[PDB]
Write a protein that binds this ligand. Sequence first.
Ligand SMILES: *[C@@H]1O[C@H](CO)[C@@H](O[C@@H]2O[C@H](CO)[C@@H](O[C@@H]3O[C@H](CO[C@H]4O[C@H](CO)[C@@H](O)[C@H](O)[C@@H]4O)[C@@H](O)[C@H](O[C@H]4O[C@H](CO)[C@@H](O)[C@H](O)[C@@H]4O)[C@@H]3O)[C@H](O)[C@H]2NC(C)=O)[C@H](O)[C@H]1NC(C)=O
Ligand SMILES: *[C@@H]1O[C@H](CO)[C@@H](O[C@@H]2O[C@H](CO)[C@@H](O[C@@H]3O[C@H](CO[C@H]4O[C@H](CO)[C@@H](O)[C@H](O)[C@@H]4O)[C@@H](O)[C@H](O)[C@@H]3O)[C@H](O)[C@H]2NC(C)=O)[C@H](O)[C@H]1NC(C)=O
Ligand SMILES: *[C@@H]1O[C@H](CO)[C@@H](O[C@@H]2O[C@H](CO)[C@@H](O)[C@H](O)[C@H]2NC(C)=O)[C@H](O)[C@H]1NC(C)=O
Ligand SMILES: *[C@@H]1O[C@H](CO)[C@@H](O)[C@H](O)[C@H]1NC(C)=O
Ligand SMILES: *[C@@H]1O[C@H](CO)[C@@H](O)[C@H](O)[C@H]1NC(C)=O
Ligand SMILES: *[C@@H]1O[C@H](CO)[C@@H](O)[C@H](O)[C@H]1NC(C)=O
Ligand SMILES: *[C@@H]1O[C@H](CO)[C@@H](O)[C@H](O)[C@H]1NC(C)=O
Ligand SMILES: *[C@@H]1O[C@H](CO)[C@@H](O)[C@H](O)[C@H]1NC(C)=O
Ligand SMILES: *[C@@H]1O[C@H](CO)[C@@H](O)[C@H](O)[C@H]1NC(C)=O
Length: 751
Amino acid sequence: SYPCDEKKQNDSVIAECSNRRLQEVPQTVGKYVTELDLSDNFITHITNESFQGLQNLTKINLNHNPNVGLNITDGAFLNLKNLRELLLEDNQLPQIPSGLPESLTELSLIQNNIYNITKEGISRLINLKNLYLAWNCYFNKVCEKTNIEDGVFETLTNLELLSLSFNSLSHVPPKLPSSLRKLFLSNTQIKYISEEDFKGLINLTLLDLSGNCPRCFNAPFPCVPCDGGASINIDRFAFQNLTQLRYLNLSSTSLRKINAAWFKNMPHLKVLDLEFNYLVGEIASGAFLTMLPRLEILDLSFNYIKGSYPQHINISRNFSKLLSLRALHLRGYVFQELREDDFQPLMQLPNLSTINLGINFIKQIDFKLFQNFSNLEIIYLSENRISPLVNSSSFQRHIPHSNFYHFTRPLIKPQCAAYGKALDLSLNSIFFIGPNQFENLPDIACLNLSANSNAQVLSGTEFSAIPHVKYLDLTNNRLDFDNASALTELSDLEVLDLSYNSHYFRIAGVTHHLEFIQNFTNLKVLNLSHNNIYTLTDKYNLESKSLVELVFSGNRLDILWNDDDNRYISIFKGLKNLTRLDLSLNRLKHIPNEAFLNLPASLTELHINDNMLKFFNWTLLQQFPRLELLDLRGNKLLFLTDSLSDFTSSLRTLLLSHNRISHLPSGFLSSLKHLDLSSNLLKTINKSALKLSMLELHGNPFECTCDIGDFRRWMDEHLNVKIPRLVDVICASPGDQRGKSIVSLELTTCV
Ligand SMILES: *[C@@H]1O[C@H](CO)[C@@H](O[C@@H]2O[C@H](CO)[C@@H](O[C@@H]3O[C@H](CO[C@H]4O[C@H](CO)[C@@H](O)[C@H](O)[C@@H]4O)[C@@H](O)[C@H](O[C@H]4O[C@H](CO)[C@@H](O)[C@H](O)[C@@H]4O)[C@@H]3O)[C@H](O)[C@H]2NC(C)=O)[C@H](O)[C@H]1NC(C)=O
Ligand SMILES: *[C@@H]1O[C@H](CO)[C@@H](O[C@@H]2O[C@H](CO)[C@@H](O[C@@H]3O[C@H](CO[C@H]4O[C@H](CO)[C@@H](O)[C@H](O)[C@@H]4O)[C@@H](O)[C@H](O)[C@@H]3O)[C@H](O)[C@H]2NC(C)=O)[C@H](O)[C@H]1NC(C)=O
Ligand SMILES: *[C@@H]1O[C@H](CO)[C@@H](O[C@@H]2O[C@H](CO)[C@@H](O)[C@H](O)[C@H]2NC(C)=O)[C@H](O)[C@H]1NC(C)=O
Ligand SMILES: *[C@@H]1O[C@H](CO)[C@@H](O)[C@H](O)[C@H]1NC(C)=O
Ligand SMILES: *[C@@H]1O[C@H](CO)[C@@H](O)[C@H](O)[C@H]1NC(C)=O
Ligand SMILES: *[C@@H]1O[C@H](CO)[C@@H](O)[C@H](O)[C@H]1NC(C)=O
Ligand SMILES: *[C@@H]1O[C@H](CO)[C@@H](O)[C@H](O)[C@H]1NC(C)=O
Ligand SMILES: *[C@@H]1O[C@H](CO)[C@@H](O)[C@H](O)[C@H]1NC(C)=O
Ligand SMILES: *[C@@H]1O[C@H](CO)[C@@H](O)[C@H](O)[C@H]1NC(C)=O
């Protein structure tokens, strides 16, 4: 299957064929295909010729064509009347391709030049459930405003989703179809919303009016405010008939007042986005809060008053009325202290599991207040000013197809929250953890203390008040490991991340003690990456009866092993239950044979990539019966073993990309399902016949003489072995040949 990778399932077959440098649509496309993917190519012409009696095709993706306009022939797709989804994004169009099929349910024309939405190109469409027209006249192109001729949509009676964001409309278009469920109009330069704007949209569940009269604060053009920094103006009766509304986005509309009356007839509102407005007032005395007993997510982030740095956050009593609230986002309100009384209104909300107070520059917090909550699972306090526990103004400056407006990535890694209540204190000033640092905290399972300039010597008492932490993140600090009892008070610890604490490890004379590792009975994952460890004090071996994974990259094994009295010859041996080991980025030029033999026999996965090894004693693989993955990418390897099977019976994956292998020997030979030989120095592959699902080869300098026949043969016979990127497997020589994919070859002249 070339050049498109025909993948199968589920209950339909698709031809993955994008980003292959195509100038055209291959005709040689397996019949009876559900849909085709042709995004990210150089195609420039779409025509009747283009799709011939495909018939079967339901979906077509032609986005990003070409990667520098796109020419399309009227009625080009009509030959396909089973076409339901058509994607034409980033194709630089200046009009809605005329003559479009009526079988379309979904049509995307995002990121194009279309400034006129018309009945000729649209109204026929009829079966459209989803229509996307975002990013066409987003000043400038140049483009004054988007023009929608009156009634273009009313004939689309099955229209469930209409997206017109990032287009200058000035006014909401009339004659909208009552079937609408989602209406996106973010950044449409609409300043006034009238009573009649959404008159008959009785089925709306989502309305996005964000970025209209934005609060540009600390941003330049294309961010453009309404004259005099005025907020969007919404009529009192603008939403009286939108009783099905679940999601309302009013982020960055420069609102100062929220009219409670807008919500009288909106009992189902689950999500309300009010980020990037000027609502500190409303937050203190907002009547609109009494109208939302069913709200689950309220985002009030970045509503700070420039230059204001109040002592306390002023949260209205009415917050107590948001009985269905599950998450409250209060980033960037900016205040100095959080007292138990300040959060009174929220202590009764039964479903509140997430409180986000990131970026508030809070100096003090009465932590006992968190114990008075029914369901907190996530306490996000990153980027605050908590100090070790023994003003009047401030200068805070803030600086797709995607959004919601809140960094949709989770607040805490999921591998961490999964264990329980999570507390994030990263990016604070806990440069030293005091004796009462964590007093009065609920039972925390997940804790992040990353990036706090902490240079202390942990001694075994710092976490006595929260001894049930399972996942502890101590990355990016300058901890001084000079006490064997460090962290032993966390008997339940399962994941410990000490990455990026190189500062004391680098200094000669300072002592380093990692003995605490063995004291944990349930420790599973330990990451000591990027610590430049090159010596240990007194106790030279890491040991754990439980540890399963050890990430030791970015340290200095070259020094620990490559020199010495064999002090660290058995450094990892005592990791009796280890299955994964990362030794990348350790500047290894040579591994002592006994050093390698002492790695735990229990290993199933070993990474040694990105070192500088030139030889590898394969024979050593004999002592690793359970070894399934072996990674050696990014080295300087020269030769391969001639008898691989006399050493391994379990190896399944072998990664050797970015090496200096120039000759693949006889064989091999095997449980080996994956082999990566991409980016090496293979001029050609000698016959080497024969159970493997994948073989990577792009990047080698192949010699395209008739010798490329044995191999060329090989592939033809085995379409059962995936060769990702055949397109990139290229001829290095000879010169007429060079640059040509080893399959494009006009072999015939070979006779
Ligand atoms: C210190 O060292 C530790 C340990 O290695 C690092 O933490 C690990 O980080 C790795 C890499 O981020 C994590 O692996 C990732 O896990 C994600 C979540 O997995 C869960 O959910 C999936 C399905 O979503 C299940 O399959 C799975 O069993 C888990 O329940 C995955 O989503 C990630 O995606 C992977 O697969 C996709 C396939 O599409 C690929 O696109 C990705 O590239 C990737 O291969 C990935 O598997 C691992 O969870 C971490 N361990 C822990 C305990 O957190 C630290 O980050 C490191 N510290 C620093 C600073 O580097
Ligand atoms: C204003 O707030 C709005 C209310 O939340 C925001 O609306 C959201 O906008 C985002 C981005 O445009 C949409 O997210 C996308 O959704 C599609 C659809 O995926 C569907 O299928 C997947 C299966 O994989 C499923 O998991 C989803 O739940 C969907 O059913 C995705 O394909 C995209 O990758 C992306 O996630 C939201 O869907 C949309 N919310 C809703 C409820 O429709 C809006 O973005 C905000 N405005 C701005 C300017 O930020
Ligand atoms: C602890 O918080 C830190 C800081 O926010 C997180 O580290 C960042 O992680 C993100 C995404 O993984 C990266 O884009 C940043 O570069 C990281 N910054 C720093 C300072 O390291 C970290 O992921 C958090 N840890 C957990 C377990 O949630
Ligand atoms: C819109 O709201 C007004 C308010 O009186 C009401 O009279 C009208 O019936 C509503 N329209 C629809 C279609 O529900
Ligand atoms: C504890 O929570 C309840 C609300 O559930 C509240 O009445 C009480 O005042 C809180 N305790 C303190 C000390 O704030
Ligand atoms: C909210 O909390 C109540 C009481 O703990 C629980 O019964 C309910 O299921 C929770 N709501 C959701 C949506 O999980
Ligand atoms: C570790 O720290 C504890 C508390 O400071 C201390 O009592 C002990 O002497 C230190 N040294 C060792 C090796 O445990
Ligand atoms: C940790 O293990 C070492 C060596 O077995 C032992 O000396 C020490 O008492 C242990 N520490 C704790 C807190 O259990
Ligand atoms: C070995 O690792 C496995 C997998 O996490 C774990 O279940 C087992 O308890 C570990 N062994 C010991 C001795 O803790």
